[PDB]
Write an enzyme that holds these catalytic residues in place. Structure first.
Site, short mmCIF file in Angstrom:
data_model
loop_
_atom_site.label_atom_id
_atom_site.label_comp_id
_atom_site.label_asym_id
_atom_site.label_seq_id
_atom_site.Cartn_x
_atom_site.Cartn_y
_atom_site.Cartn_z
N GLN A 97 0.85 -1.20 0.00
CA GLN A 97 0.00 0.00 0.00
C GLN A 97 0.89 1.25 0.00
O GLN A 97 1.63 1.47 0.94
CB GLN A 97 -0.94 0.01 1.21
CG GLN A 97 -1.99 1.15 1.16
CD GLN A 97 -2.82 1.29 2.43
OE1 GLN A 97 -2.28 1.46 3.51
NE2 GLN A 97 -4.15 1.25 2.30
N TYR A 177 -5.42 11.10 4.19
CA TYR A 177 -4.01 11.30 3.89
C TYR A 177 -3.85 12.11 2.62
O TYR A 177 -4.83 12.68 2.14
CB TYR A 177 -3.27 9.96 3.89
CG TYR A 177 -3.23 9.39 5.29
CD1 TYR A 177 -2.55 10.03 6.31
CD2 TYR A 177 -3.92 8.22 5.60
CE1 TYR A 177 -2.54 9.53 7.60
CE2 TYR A 177 -3.91 7.69 6.87
CZ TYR A 177 -3.21 8.36 7.88
OH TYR A 177 -3.22 7.83 9.16
N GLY A 307 -9.77 -6.18 9.23
CA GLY A 307 -8.65 -5.52 9.85
C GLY A 307 -8.34 -6.12 11.21
O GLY A 307 -7.53 -7.02 11.31
C1 LIG Z 1 -4.17 -0.57 14.05
C2 LIG Z 1 -4.78 -0.19 12.74
C3 LIG Z 1 -3.94 0.15 11.70
C4 LIG Z 1 -4.48 0.48 10.46
N1 LIG Z 1 -3.64 0.85 9.43
C5 LIG Z 1 -4.15 1.16 8.19
C6 LIG Z 1 -3.29 1.48 7.13
O1 LIG Z 1 -2.07 1.47 7.31
N2 LIG Z 1 -3.81 1.81 5.90
C7 LIG Z 1 -5.19 1.80 5.74
O2 LIG Z 1 -5.69 2.08 4.66
N3 LIG Z 1 -6.03 1.47 6.78
C8 LIG Z 1 -5.52 1.15 8.01
N4 LIG Z 1 -6.38 0.81 9.04
C9 LIG Z 1 -7.85 0.77 8.81
C10 LIG Z 1 -8.18 -0.70 8.46
O3 LIG Z 1 -7.60 -1.06 7.22
C11 LIG Z 1 -9.69 -0.96 8.38
O4 LIG Z 1 -10.30 -0.07 7.44
C12 LIG Z 1 -10.34 -0.80 9.75
O5 LIG Z 1 -9.62 -1.48 10.77
C13 LIG Z 1 -11.79 -1.28 9.74
O6 LIG Z 1 -11.90 -2.62 9.32
P1 LIG Z 1 -12.15 -3.74 10.45
O7 LIG Z 1 -13.41 -3.39 11.23
O8 LIG Z 1 -12.33 -5.06 9.73
O9 LIG Z 1 -11.00 -3.74 11.42
C14 LIG Z 1 -5.86 0.47 10.28
C15 LIG Z 1 -6.71 0.12 11.32
C16 LIG Z 1 -6.16 -0.22 12.56
C17 LIG Z 1 -7.06 -0.60 13.70
C1 LIG Z 2 -10.09 5.30 11.47
C2 LIG Z 2 -8.76 5.19 10.79
C3 LIG Z 2 -7.76 6.15 10.97
N1 LIG Z 2 -7.94 7.29 11.82
O1 LIG Z 2 -6.92 7.71 12.51
O2 LIG Z 2 -9.01 7.87 11.92
C4 LIG Z 2 -6.54 5.99 10.32
C5 LIG Z 2 -6.31 4.90 9.49
N2 LIG Z 2 -5.06 4.76 8.83
O3 LIG Z 2 -4.98 4.34 7.61
O4 LIG Z 2 -4.04 5.08 9.42
C6 LIG Z 2 -7.29 3.95 9.32
C7 LIG Z 2 -8.50 4.10 9.97
N3 LIG Z 2 -9.46 3.08 9.74
O5 LIG Z 2 -9.56 2.65 8.61
O6 LIG Z 2 -10.19 2.59 10.71
#
Ligand SMILES: Cc1cc2nc3c(=O)[nH]c(=O)nc-3n(C[C@H](O)[C@H](O)[C@H](O)COP(=O)(O)O)c2cc1C
Ligand SMILES: Cc1c([N+](=O)[O-])cc([N+](=O)[O-])cc1[N+](=O)[O-]
Length: 349
Positions: A97, A177, A307
Site C-alpha cells: 500500500q 491522507y 482488519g
Molecule cells: C491498528 C490499525 C492500523 C491500520 N492501518 C491502516 C493502514 O495502514 N492503511 C489503511 O488504509 N487502513 C488502516 N487501518 C484501517 C483498516 O484497514 C480498516 O479499514 C479498519 O480497521 C476497519 O476494518 P475492520 O473493522 O475489519 O477492522 C488500520 C486500522 C487499525 C485498527
Molecule cells: C479510522 C482510521 C484512521 N484514523 O486515525 O481515523 C486511520 C487509518 N489509517 O490508515 O491510518 C485507518 C482508519 N481506519 O480505517 O479505521
C-alpha cells in the site's frame, strides 16, 4: 458466492475472498526498514486471499508515525524483498500500500520541516502516538511543481515495490491522507490544475494511479478509498459525486479493485461506487462472517477485507470456515514495539 470461493483480481488468482486489510503496526527497524519480525507476521497470515500491506511511505516527507516502513530506497527494497519471498513460499499473495500522509504528521518526523498538503489548513485534534500530546501543525501548501515531484515519488515507489517482488500495489487514497486531502473540497482550496473543480481535485490521485499503471499494468493496481470521509478531519461538499467520479475514472483504467473502508449503513455509497467502477469491489469495516457472506450473496461486494480480526487471528480464514472462536484483540499493542501483540496471537488447536 461465499467468502471461501476463489476470486481473480486482474490475472492474480486468489484462493478465497477473505482479504487482510492494510494495517499500520509500527514494527519496522530503524530507518523505516522492513525486518524479519514483519516477515514472520505476514507469513502467519498467508492464508488470506490477498494481503494488503501496512501503509508504506513513498518519501521521507510522507511519514507521520514512528517505525512505519518506507519504499523509497534500496535498503527498504531489500527488507521488503525478504518479506515477499517468505509470504510467497508460504503460499500467500501480497500488495504494497503506497502512502503519503500529507498534513497528518508532525515536524519531529520531518527534521523540523512542516508537513505538506494541498492547502494550509490545520487538521483538528492531536497527533497520534506523539508525546506529550501535541496539536498538528498547520501544513505548508505545496507548489505546483512539488506536486509533480510527489507523482514521481509514487512512480519510484511503485517501481521499488515491483523490484521487491510484490504481487501488486494499492494506492492509499483514503483516511484523510495526502491524496484524500487533494480529493475533498474542505481540505483543497487550490486554484491551480490540482484544485477548484472535481476534475482538478481528483487529478493527483489519477496521476499517481496512472504512474503505477505504467509500472505494473492496471490489473495489478488497486485503490483504497474512505467514502464516508470520517477520519482525520475530512469533509467534502458532495461526496456522492466526488467518489463516483473517482470510481468511474478508475474503472475506465481497468484497475484490479477498489477497497473502501465503509461500514454498512443506510447512507453507504459503496453501491454507487461499485456500479460506476464496474470491477471487483472489496468492502471493509466492522464486517463479520455473517454480514460479509450476506454482502457477497446480495452482490454488494466481491470480497471482504478484515482488519482487527486479522490482527488477532493469523488463521482467520480457517477460523471462519470452522465457525470457531476468535481471539480477542488487544488494542494496546496495535502500535508500539516488538513481538508482543504482533506475532503471539495463537492459531487454532
Ligand atoms: C491498528 C490499525 C492500523 C491500520 N492501518 C491502516 C493502514 O495502514 N492503511 C489503511 O488504509 N487502513 C488502516 N487501518 C484501517 C483498516 O484497514 C480498516 O479499514 C479498519 O480497521 C476497519 O476494518 P475492520 O473493522 O475489519 O477492522 C488500520 C486500522 C487499525 C485498527
Ligand atoms: C479510522 C482510521 C484512521 N484514523 O486515525 O481515523 C486511520 C487509518 N489509517 O490508515 O491510518 C485507518 C482508519 N481506519 O480505517 O479505521
Amino acid at each position: 458466492t461465499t467468502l471461501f470461493d476463489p476470486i481473480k483480481l486482474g490475472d492474480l488468482q486468489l484462493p478465497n475472498r477473505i482479504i487482510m486489510a492494510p494495517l499500520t503496526r509500527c514494527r519496522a527497524d530503524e530507518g523505516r526498514v522492513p525486518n524479519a519480525l514483519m516477515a514472520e507476521y505476514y507469513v502467519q497470515r498467508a492464508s488470506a486471499g490477498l494481503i494488503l500491506s501496512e501503509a508504506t511511505s513513498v518519501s521521507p516527507m510522507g511519514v507521520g508515525y514512528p517505525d512505519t516502513p518506507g519504499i523509497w530506497n534500496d535498503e527498504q527494497v531489500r527488507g521488503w524483498n525478504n518479506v515477499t519471498k517468505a509470504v510467497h513460499a508460504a503460499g500467500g499473495r501480497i500488495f504494497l500500500q503506497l502512502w503519503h500522509v500529507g498534513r497528518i504528521s508532525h515536524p519531529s518526523y520531518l527534521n523540523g520541516e512542516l508537513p505538506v498538503a494541498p492547502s494550509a489548513i490545520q487538521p483538528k485534534g492531536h497527533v497520534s502516538l506523539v508525546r506529550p500530546l501535541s496539536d498538528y501543525p498547520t501544513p505548508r501548501a505545496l507548489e505546483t511543481e512539488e506536486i509533480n515531484d510527489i507523482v514521481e515519488a509514487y512512480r519510484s515507489g511503485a517501481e521499488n515495490a515491483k523490484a521487491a517482488g510484490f504481487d501488486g500495489v494499492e494506492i492509499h487514497g483514503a483516511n484523510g491522507y495526502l491524496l484524500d486531502q487533494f480529493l475533498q473540497s474542505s481540505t483543497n482550496q487550490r486554484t491551480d490544475r490540482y484544485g477548484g473543480s472535481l476534475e482538478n481535485r481528483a487529478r493527483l490521485l489519477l496521476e499517481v494511479t496512472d504512474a503505477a499503471i505504467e509500472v505494473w499494468g492496471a490489473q495489478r493496481v488497486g485503490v483504497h478509498l474512505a467514502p464516508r470521509a470520517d477520519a482525520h478531519d475530512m469533509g467534502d461538499a458532495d461526496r456522492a459525486e466526488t467518489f463516483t467520479y473517482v470510481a468511474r475514472e478508475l474503472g475506465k483504467r481497468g484497475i484490479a479493485f477498489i477497497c473502501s473502508r465503509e461500514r454498512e449503513a443506510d447512507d453507504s455509497i459503496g453501491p454507487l461506487i461499485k456500479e460506476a467502477f464496474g470491477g471487483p469491489y472489496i468492502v471493509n469495516e466492522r464486517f463479520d462472517k455473517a454480514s460479509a457472506n450476506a454482502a457477497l450473496a446480495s452482490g454488494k461486494a466481491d470480497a471482504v477485507a478484515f482488519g482487527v480480526p486479522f490482527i488477532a487471528n493469523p488463521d482467520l480464514p480457517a477460523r471462519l470456515a470452522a465457525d470457531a472462536p476468535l481471539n480477542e484483540a488487544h488494542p494496546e499493542t496495535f502500535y508500539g514495539k516488538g513481538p508482543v501483540g504482533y506475532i503471539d496471537y495463537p492459531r487454532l488447536k
